[PDB]
Amino acid sequence: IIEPSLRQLAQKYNCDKMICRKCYARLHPRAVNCRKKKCGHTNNLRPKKKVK
Amino acid sequence: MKTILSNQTVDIPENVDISLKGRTVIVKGPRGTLRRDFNHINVELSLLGKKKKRLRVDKWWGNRKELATVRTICSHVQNMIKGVTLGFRYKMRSVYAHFPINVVIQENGSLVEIRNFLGEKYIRRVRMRPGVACSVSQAQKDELVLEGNDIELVSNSAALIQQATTVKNKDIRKFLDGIYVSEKGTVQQA
Amino acid sequence: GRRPARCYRYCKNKPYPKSRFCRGVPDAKIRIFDLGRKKAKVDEFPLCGHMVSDEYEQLSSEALEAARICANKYMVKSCGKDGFHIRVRLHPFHVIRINKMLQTGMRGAFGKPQGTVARVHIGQVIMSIRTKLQNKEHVVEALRRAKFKFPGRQKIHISKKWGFTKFNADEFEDMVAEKRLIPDGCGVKYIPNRGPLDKWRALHS
Amino acid sequence: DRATWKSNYFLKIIQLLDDYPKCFIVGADNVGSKQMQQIRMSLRGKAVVLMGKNTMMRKAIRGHLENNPALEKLLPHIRGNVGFVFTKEDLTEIRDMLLANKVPAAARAGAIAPCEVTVPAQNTGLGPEKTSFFQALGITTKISRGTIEILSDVQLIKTGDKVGASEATLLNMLNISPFSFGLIIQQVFDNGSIYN
Amino acid sequence: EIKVVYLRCTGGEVGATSALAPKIGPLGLSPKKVGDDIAKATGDWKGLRITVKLTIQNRQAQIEVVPSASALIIKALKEPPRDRKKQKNIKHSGNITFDEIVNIARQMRHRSLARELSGTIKEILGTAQSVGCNVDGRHPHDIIDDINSGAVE
RNA sequence: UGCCGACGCUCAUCAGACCCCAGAAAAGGUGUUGGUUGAUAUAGACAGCAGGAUGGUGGCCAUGGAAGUCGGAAUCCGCUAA
Ligand SMILES: [Mg+2]
Ligand SMILES: [Mg+2]
Ligand SMILES: [Zn+2]
């Protein structure tokens, strides 16, 4: 159905992200602070949930 | 506090001829000419060294925000040297599950038509930036190759064609379809 | 069920204790004041940490119980159930009043008792946790979590005393070894040079 | 604690450099202590092995340059991942048995194969599996009677060939480990003598 | 065609749920036919899990026994085994002397993965109290006896 | 004040601007600036790119079973660069 080395490219660009708990912003995986001004650049981050 | 002097340094190879008009850097070599204007940074650029082997960037009496812009210029000029000597090549794959992404090339690489993305009847026509040539490559199944001298224009065109194939109102973690940047490199090797 | 704590926050009225004049006060929300391993000797919990108020305000008994429950439940998870002693050094003695509007308005508007708060000054210790020297950051984190149950601003201060005593920790062991201090369960007894000599003989024998 | 072990390493260098002045330097390249302990059992009465910081190694022996002038050339010859093994007895038998005692190590993704590796005719021992990962490189194999049975020898990786993870799961399932990474000898020390 | 298999066993008592089937699968031996022998040839353990290895030839099996490090300690300390219910308070409350640990030292000397005699008593006397046992006392009594009063041959 | 005023701080896609006084709190920020305290650093540190995390042990504990990972008293050895 799909090739795995092509799959990890799309997981890198689509779901391997960090989500801000305060403003739902999609951040890079090595993020400790959200880049949005409206949440006050908070450090309250979580990983993006992996699909099952 | 303001640091008295902050300087950084670009080592220019002998294949490259560089000249400056104030804060406007012109770079000429084997593949062409690149011009970048730096009148918004307010630094001192010096083309010292006989035969101009070395370029020096100075910030005098700068704060922490102003000292960050020095190696930014030293990276931009190195990117221009790299893109005039070796060039820039953005190899990028197209990932799909069911519908094959049909990619055709028009007007000698300046326009790219995308058909059958997620089974849609809409044709995505992507204009390319002036100076960037796009082509369907060989030896791989579904891969496009972008060619140029300017990393800004090449990567911005790659961002345009990547954001052209985006999935709307679906779970994008499941619908992992599009055209994604796989490898960033040069035209010829070093 | 009750009013928010911003109503009865500042020390406005004179202190109004439970007495033979003010009767009918409901029971205070906090009744357990010290807990953990409170049956512990002096020489095994040498580190003491205080939460110290920086404001002159009233702290409710509900807030006191909510803070000590949180401090207990963090310190049990952090250092075990028998490796600490938490003592709340504030007892709710001020009685706040409620004037119910069922329509007489402000005629005869003296309040019936509603609840109990504690009048707290600047620099006054709210809670004190004693434990070993290795559990310093756990005491700091437990008091930092308990700061969120209180109005106003509090500070965290690691004391220079030895546990729940009034003697300095650098000289405490020497003063015990010179038999000027005697262990007396949770705290110590200070022995001066002013008694009859028959107690000095019983001390040094 | 590091403050005391940092002083314990110097005594270990100082009181053993005067013991064995015949030091065949070996290279610890992706090796584990489970492989080191197998070496240490045969190497008790003859040679002793040691690992440590190479800068601290450069510091310890340069305090011996005054009272032991035979140790001058060791500082240009300790670069990269370097550990000690110390020997007094002979120079040839420690060539013989160190290259003898080898245990196999599993394949990696980015580790070279230094010689020609063959795949002999042997049954896999498992029935119907992924048959699309056999003709991808070019291995001829007919699925005979359900169980996958391979036919002939296919040179998967020759010398001067970069490797990847495309040939790792088929080795892991069949327990075929091509190369055993061992302590290769880089430098020879016999009282000042240097050999290749 | 020799092909050994690594299999963990339960003892001389027969269990209920079988997990030994897939490793004896590809050569084709009957599970209870080999499971009666894997218990009866072993025989002595009868109470605790033990790695009894299975070295099968092209025709029939061989029942070899490779003891563990502290399973021999549990075997030497003779607690009477109860039924298979695994009831409460089956702890090891018994006394071990200094002669019931040198046999493991000589065994692991003969198999050669250890330090010298102080080391090969030092693993097993250190791990004797790991389970919750005592060699007439806790681990602080094996650091005093090894220093200048050891049982080194 | 049209003084060639002094030294700093601050960028707001909601800047701020003078007793009463005419509008804000707890909590936060890897924005930036100044401090307090504690570490380790040429016996070579923080990044950044590999090996290895096991032997006892699948610890005893409580369970339908929890095996370095779902609870809780515990929290010791070897080899050791680990
Ligand atoms: Mg939907
Ligand atoms: Mg009043
Ligand atoms: Zn955010």
Identify the residue whose tokens are 């009847």: B121
This structure was determined by: cryo-EM
**The two three-digit tokens of residue A17, written as one number:** 């992200």
Maximum alpha-carbon separation in chain C: 77
Nearest in space to C167 (alpha carbons), one of C184, C189, C134: C189
Where b means 16+ CB within 10 Å and e means fewer, D15-32 reads eebeebbbbbbbbbeebe
Measuring CA to CA, which residue among D173, D80, D76 is closest to residue D124?
D173
Domain housing E29: 3-66
List residues bridging with B35 in a β-sheet. Answer: B26
Taking every pair of C-alpha atoms in chain E, what is the biggest distance, in angstroms? Answer: 57
Q: How far is the CA of E126 from the centre of ligand 3 (A)?
A: 53
Is the shortest CB-to-strand distance from D166 to strand F under 7 Å?
A: no
**Chain A residues with CB-CB distance to B93 below 8 A:** 6, 9
Half-sphere exposure of residue E112, counting CA atoms within 13 Å on the CB side? 7
Amino acid identity of residue E45, one-letter, is W
Burial of C143 (0-12, 13-18, 19+ CB in 10 A): buried
Q: Distance (Å, rounded) from C-alpha C9 to C-alpha D27?
A: 72
Using DSSP, state whether B184 is helix, strand or coil: strand
Task: State the SS3 of chain E.
Answer: CCEEECCCECCCCCCCCCCCHHHHCCCCCCHHHHHHHHHHCCCCCCCCCECEEEEECCCCCCEEECCCCCHHHHHHCCCCCCCCCCCCCCCCCCCCCCCCCHHHHHHHHHHCCCCCHHHHHHHHHHHHCCCCCCCCCCHHHHHHHCCCCCCCC
Any idea what DSSP says for residue D166? Answer: G
CA atoms within 13 A on the CB side of B17: 6
DSSP B142-180: SEEEEEES-HHHHHHHHHHHHHHS---SS-TTT---EEE
Q: Compute the radius of gyration of chain D from its Cα atoms.
A: 23
3-class secondary structure per residue, C93-128: CEEEEECCCCCCCCCCCCCEEEEEEEEECCCCEEEE
Output phi, psi for C81, to 5 deg.
-75, -15
Helices (H), B46-138: 64-67, 69-85
Alpha-carbon distance of E22 to E6, in angstroms, equals 12
CA distances from E25 to B68, C67, D98, E34 (A): 67, 62, 39, 12
- C-alpha B73/C-alpha B151 separation (Å) is 14
Q: Which residues contact D134 (CB under 8 A, 6 or more apart)?
A: D141, D148, D150, D170
In angstroms, rounded to a whole number, what is the distance separating the alpha carbons of residues B75 and B93?
A: 27
Does at least one atom of strand F sit less than 7 Å from the CB of A29? no
Answer whether B133's CB lies under 8 Å from B108's CB: yes
CA D38 to chain centre: 13
Segment (H or E) for D26: strand D25-27
Distant-in-sequence, close-in-space partners of E29: CB < 8 Å, separation ≥ 6: E56, E60, E61
Strand pairing class (C187-190; C181-184):
antiparallel
Closest-lying nucleotide for C82 based on CA to C1': F73
Classify residue A17 by its DSSP letter.
Answer: -
Pairing relation of β-strands B111-115 and B124-127? antiparallel
Decide if D24 contacts D188 (C-beta within 8 A): yes
Cβ separation of B177 and A6 shorter than 8 Å?
Answer: no
Compute the distance between CA of residue C73 and CA of residue E137 in angstroms, rounded to an integer. Answer: 36
Q: Under DSSP, is residue B43 helix (H, G, I), strand (E, B) or coil?
A: coil
Between CA D35 and CA C201 the distance in angstroms is 70
Burial class, B131, CB count within 10 angstroms (exposed 0-12 / middle 13-18 / buried 19+): middle
* E110: phi then psi, degrees, rounded to nearest 5: -65, -25
Q: What is the 3-state secondary structure (H, E, C) of chain C?
A: CCCCCCCCCCCCCCCCCCCCCCCCCCCCCCCCCEEECCCCCHHHCCEEEEEEECCCEEEEHHHHHHHHHHHHHHHHHHHCCCCEEEEECCCCCEEEEECCCCCCCCCCCCCEEEEEEEEECCCCEEEEEEECHHHHHHHHHHHHHHHHHCCCCEEEEECCECCCCCCEHHHHHHHHHCCCEEEECCEEEECCCCCCHHHHHHHHC
CA distance C3 to C114: 9
**E74-113 residues near strand F (Cβ < 7 Å):** 86, 88-91
Please state the three-class secondary structure of D67-121 as a single string: CCCCCCCCHHHCCCCCEEEEECCCCCHHHHHHCCCCCCCCCCCCCCCCCCCCCCC
Tell me the C-alpha to C-alpha distance, in Å, between residue C60 and each of B133, C97, C113, C121. Answer: 73, 13, 14, 14
In whole angstroms, give the CA distance from residue D103 to residue B122: 61
How many whole angstroms separate alpha carbon D51 and alpha carbon D12? Answer: 11
- Resolution of the structure in the document, Å: 2.8
Beta-carbon separation of A9 and B177 below 8 A: no
Please report, as a single letter, which amino acid is at residue C81.
K
Tokens of A8: 């990890």
CA of C87 to C1' of F74 (A): 28
Angle between helix B151-164 and helix B69-85 axes, rounded to 10 deg: 90
Residues of A in contact with B174 (CB under 8 A): 51
Other beta carbons within 10 Å of C139: 28
Which long-range contacts (C-beta less than 8 Å, at least 24 apart) are formed by D126-133?
Answer: D126/D173, D133/D169, D133/D170
Residues in contact with D92: Cβ distance below 8 Å, sequence separation at least 6, in sequence order: none
Q: What are the chain D neighbours of E113 within 8 Å (beta carbons)?
A: 37-38, 41
Please, are residues B176 and B95 in contact by the beta-carbon 8 Å criterion?
yes
Q: Across the interface, do E113 and D125 touch by the CB < 8 Å criterion?
A: no
H or E segment at A52? none
Q: Are C188 and C165 in contact (CB under 8 A)?
A: yes
Domain harbouring E9, CATH code: 3.30.1550.10
Q: Note the strand F nucleotides within 7 A of protein beta carbons.
A: 9, 13, 26-34, 41-45, 50-63, 65, 72-73, 76-82
The crossing angle, in degrees rounded to 10, of helices C136-146 and C61-79 is: 150
Q: How far is the CA of C13 from the centre of ligand 2 (A)?
A: 4
In this structure, are residues C157 and C147 in contact, taking their beta carbons and an 8 Å threshold? no
Q: What is the separation of C-alpha B113 from the centre of its chain, rounded to a whole number of angstroms?
A: 21
E123 touches strand F (CB under 7 A): yes
CA distance D113 to D107: 9
Question: In this structure, what DSSP letter does residue D62 have?
Answer: T
CA gap E54, E38 in Å, rounded: 8
> Is the Cβ atom of D145 within 7 Å of strand F at any atom?
no
Helix axes D2-17, D54-61, angle to 10 degrees: 50
CA of B175 to the centre of ligand 1 (A): 11
Give which of C201, C180, C184, C145 is closest to C43, Cα–Cα: C184
